[PDB]
């Protein structure tokens, strides 16, 4: 999943992808931060992902969801929610 996601993000987006390589796991994280939101999208090679969007003013999460998927289409629809959640 990770490699086609990397390519999708590179093609449709300006967000910077960070790759984490560990002995047992590959993962991708996308950190974004601006005036109103501190946010991160994490996706793992085990077909799961995490969507975090914290509202700076209130200090409460706007989006805080862990998702297990099984399809690249499912991943994109989840990431779409995360994207829409910022701007």
């Amino acid at each position: 999943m990770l490699n086609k996601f990397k390519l999708w993000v590179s093609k449709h987006t300006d967000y910077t992808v960070i790759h984490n390589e560990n002995d047992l796991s590959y993962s991708i994280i996308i950190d974004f931060e601006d005036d109103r939101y501190i946010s991160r999208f994490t996706v793992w090679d085990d077909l799961s992902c995490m969507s975090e969007v914290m509202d700076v003013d209130t200090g409460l999460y706007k989006l805080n969801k862990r998702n297990e998927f099984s399809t690249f289409d499912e991943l994109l629809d989840i990431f779409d929610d995360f994207m829409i959640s910022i701007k």
Binding site: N20, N22, D23, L24, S25, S27, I29, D31, E33, I38, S39, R40, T42, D46, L47, S48, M50, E52, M54, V56, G59, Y61, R66
Partner: protein, 113 residues
Amino acid sequence: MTATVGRWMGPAEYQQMLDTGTVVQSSTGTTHVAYPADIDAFGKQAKNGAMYVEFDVPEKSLVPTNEGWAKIVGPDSIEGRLAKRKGLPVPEMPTAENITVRGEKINGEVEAK
């Protein structure tokens, strides 16, 4: 004010955790753990060679869920990045007491060690 958690981790993380007696921060920025500690909760997706380690952390360093897992609040967690921005004390990775290996992932199945 202590709580028992479980985490499937690789040899390198376990070694670091044991050498420092401190929870290792995931390279994702947030270390996830099972709460309550459960060997089967996240064993299915744990890779071969992983070890299921149970340890005790302070309750104040956990953010639990209704789905059997919890976040450990470290410097690079979302809560940690908020604290930095607001000018509040940035939370460090908590201590890990009573570190015990309770399982291993071998040949695609959850072994109990």
